[PDB]
Design a protein around this motif. Structure first.
Motif, PDB file in Angstrom:
ATOM      1  N   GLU C  70      17.004  79.014   6.428  1.00  0.00           N
ATOM      2  CA  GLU C  70      17.727  80.199   6.848  1.00  0.00           C
ATOM      3  C   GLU C  70      16.853  81.304   7.386  1.00  0.00           C
ATOM      4  O   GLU C  70      15.734  81.521   6.909  1.00  0.00           O
ATOM      5  CB  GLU C  70      18.628  80.691   5.729  1.00  0.00           C
ATOM      6  N   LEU C  83      13.767  73.658   1.325  1.00  0.00           N
ATOM      7  CA  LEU C  83      14.117  72.494   0.515  1.00  0.00           C
ATOM      8  C   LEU C  83      13.247  71.298   0.857  1.00  0.00           C
ATOM      9  O   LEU C  83      13.301  70.273   0.184  1.00  0.00           O
ATOM     10  CB  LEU C  83      15.587  72.142   0.697  1.00  0.00           C
ATOM     11  N   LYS C  90      -0.384  65.582   4.184  1.00  0.00           N
ATOM     12  CA  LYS C  90       0.313  64.529   3.446  1.00  0.00           C
ATOM     13  C   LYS C  90       0.528  63.288   4.302  1.00  0.00           C
ATOM     14  O   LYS C  90       0.604  63.381   5.529  1.00  0.00           O
ATOM     15  CB  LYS C  90       1.661  65.043   2.938  1.00  0.00           C
ATOM     16  N   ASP C  91       0.617  62.135   3.648  1.00  0.00           N
ATOM     17  CA  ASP C  91       0.820  60.845   4.319  1.00  0.00           C
ATOM     18  C   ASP C  91       1.956  60.836   5.341  1.00  0.00           C
ATOM     19  O   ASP C  91       1.884  60.115   6.349  1.00  0.00           O
ATOM     20  CB  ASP C  91       1.026  59.725   3.285  1.00  0.00           C
ATOM     21  N   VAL C  92       2.957  61.689   5.108  1.00  0.00           N
ATOM     22  CA  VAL C  92       4.126  61.806   5.992  1.00  0.00           C
ATOM     23  C   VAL C  92       4.270  63.251   6.517  1.00  0.00           C
ATOM     24  O   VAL C  92       4.160  64.222   5.751  1.00  0.00           O
ATOM     25  CB  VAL C  92       5.434  61.368   5.257  1.00  0.00           C
ATOM     26  N   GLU C  99      21.737  66.283   2.016  1.00  0.00           N
ATOM     27  CA  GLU C  99      22.750  67.291   1.577  1.00  0.00           C
ATOM     28  C   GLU C  99      22.679  68.865   1.809  1.00  0.00           C
ATOM     29  O   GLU C  99      23.702  69.520   1.639  1.00  0.00           O
ATOM     30  CB  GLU C  99      23.263  66.868   0.216  1.00  0.00           C
ATOM     31  N   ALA C 100      21.648  69.353   2.447  1.00  0.00           N
ATOM     32  CA  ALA C 100      21.431  70.757   2.691  1.00  0.00           C
ATOM     33  C   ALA C 100      22.179  71.467   3.841  1.00  0.00           C
ATOM     34  O   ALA C 100      22.329  72.673   3.766  1.00  0.00           O
ATOM     35  CB  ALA C 100      19.957  71.050   2.796  1.00  0.00           C
ATOM     36  N   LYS C 102      25.070  69.948   5.402  1.00  0.00           N
ATOM     37  CA  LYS C 102      26.212  69.079   5.620  1.00  0.00           C
ATOM     38  C   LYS C 102      27.495  69.564   6.305  1.00  0.00           C
ATOM     39  O   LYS C 102      28.076  68.827   7.102  1.00  0.00           O
ATOM     40  CB  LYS C 102      26.534  68.301   4.336  1.00  0.00           C
ATOM     41  N   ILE C 104      27.915  72.462   8.291  1.00  0.00           N
ATOM     42  CA  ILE C 104      27.667  73.396   9.372  1.00  0.00           C
ATOM     43  C   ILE C 104      28.124  72.922  10.749  1.00  0.00           C
ATOM     44  O   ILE C 104      28.322  71.735  10.991  1.00  0.00           O
ATOM     45  CB  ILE C 104      26.165  73.777   9.361  1.00  0.00           C
ATOM     46  N   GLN C 108      26.608  77.148  14.266  1.00  0.00           N
ATOM     47  CA  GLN C 108      26.018  77.822  13.109  1.00  0.00           C
ATOM     48  C   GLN C 108      24.564  77.423  12.912  1.00  0.00           C
ATOM     49  O   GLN C 108      23.759  78.228  12.468  1.00  0.00           O
ATOM     50  CB  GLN C 108      26.788  77.498  11.839  1.00  0.00           C
ATOM     51  N   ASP C 112      22.706  80.651  12.063  1.00  0.00           N
ATOM     52  CA  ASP C 112      22.353  80.875  10.669  1.00  0.00           C
ATOM     53  C   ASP C 112      20.938  80.539  10.199  1.00  0.00           C
ATOM     54  O   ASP C 112      20.413  81.213   9.303  1.00  0.00           O
ATOM     55  CB  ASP C 112      23.414  80.253   9.762  1.00  0.00           C
ATOM     56  N   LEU C 113      20.286  79.563  10.826  1.00  0.00           N
ATOM     57  CA  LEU C 113      18.928  79.196  10.424  1.00  0.00           C
ATOM     58  C   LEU C 113      17.894  79.110  11.550  1.00  0.00           C
ATOM     59  O   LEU C 113      18.246  78.996  12.720  1.00  0.00           O
ATOM     60  CB  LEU C 113      18.947  77.899   9.609  1.00  0.00           C
TER      61      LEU C 113
END
Lengths: 164, 164, 149
Positions: C70, C83, C90-92, C99-100, C102, C104, C108, C112-113
């Motif tokens: 956001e 999240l 890091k390796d990835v 689920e964060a 879902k 929108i 938006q 919103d973000l």
RNA sequence: AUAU
RNA sequence: AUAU
């Protein structure tokens, strides 16, 4: 087989009226035009009427928009309109518009089935604008833009405000 | 036939609790009230409590809303509240409130069935405000406003935040 | 294994260019919709799973972090709330957003973000290309040709 | 996957 | 309109 057909001629007001959707209702408002020099595309903001303005009535869903253009008897040049998304040079509206009301043609209208569906009445009021163009100079009242919008029929129409 | 009836007296806690809607749940938060002089209507912004603040959670739709008014033991004048659409003059809230929590009456609460329905939890926080009026001067801490809001039971807090 | 999208949902993938900034600065990139998803109607499409890549150039050395969270008041805070964050240490180098986001609307997502990017070292414009992939309900419109009158 |  |  060649079916002989006779084309009975229709008078002005005799077009098929389009009925709304079961559980929807068309409401219509008018937007008077601005003054502008020839070949200038003006922007007009879609203002909601009043009934359709309370927070509940605002969240209503849209679903067929028809654009009319009632220019007065003495106007001459070509006049055009389109309800598109808020454009960044105004004129460009006409380059994307899925339908443009041109007075140069038999019916000065524009219909937007499947174009602004599922939008909130407030959303309509926000991410879209009406554009007007004329190859002549306009004065404060030459072109009256009629906007007709289908939306879910409201719930308040059904009850009194309780008391207590 | 005349039915004789006895009115057995209820004590305080004994009121019926209103159950929520299947697929809904009620969240409640408290809003402490700032100080002001007598006969002044103050405005209190509805701030969303944390669970209901992530974006997924922010869009749950609102059902019925209930307004409480828990003023402390040493208060005296009349106190009034309502949750209306953000008014331009705080005192007009009361002229448009479909329900007002007056402490002059037995129950100090206001409910909002069929009003505010279908609005987004964020919309609640954005286009509506709480108003508090009192005939006497208040100090930061009296009149804690309780707001209880119905909304779609969030899908979110049924899982943890992922790892790696 | 490649993650399949949902029935109905199709995946849109698009990129955004690095901003050319100084070392230790958390910059912000605005998510703007790709033209195909840009119509008034396509914008109303619902979001599903969202993924975040980080395609940095072979010579960029230092830590680079990104997260899509956001719109923030103090950019750097994005990382304390994110999240999921993408690191190169890091390796990835991804950020998966199940689920964060879902419910929108693409609209938006674009309002919103925002996207934030940190680098311990100073960057040149285009040093780091950002890939963002969004699951969104398949637009109905792709099956019709635009009418002609 | 799920939900309204 | 679709379509669920």
């Amino acid at each position: 087989v060649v079916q002989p057909v006779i084309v009975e001629p229709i008078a002005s007001g005799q077009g098929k009226a389009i009925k709304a959707w079961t559980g929807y209702s068309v409401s219509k408002w008018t937007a008077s035009c601005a003054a502008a020099e020839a070949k200038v595309t003006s922007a007009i903001t879609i203002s909601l009427p009043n009934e359709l303005s309370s927070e509940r009535n605002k969240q209503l869903k849209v679903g067929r928009v028809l654009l009319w253009l009632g220019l007065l008897p003495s106007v001459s040049g070509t006049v055009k309109s389109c309800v598109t998304e808020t454009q960044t040079t105004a004129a460009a509206s006409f380059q994307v518009a899925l339908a443009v009301a041109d007075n140069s043609k038999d019916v000065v209208a524009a219909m937007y089935p499947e174009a602004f569906k599922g939008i909130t009445l407030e959303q309509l009021a926000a991410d879209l604008t009406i554009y007007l163009y004329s190859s002549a100079a306009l004065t404060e009242g030459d072109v009256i833009v009629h906007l007709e919008v289908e939306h879910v029929r409201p719930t308040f129409d059904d009850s009194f405000t309780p008391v207590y």
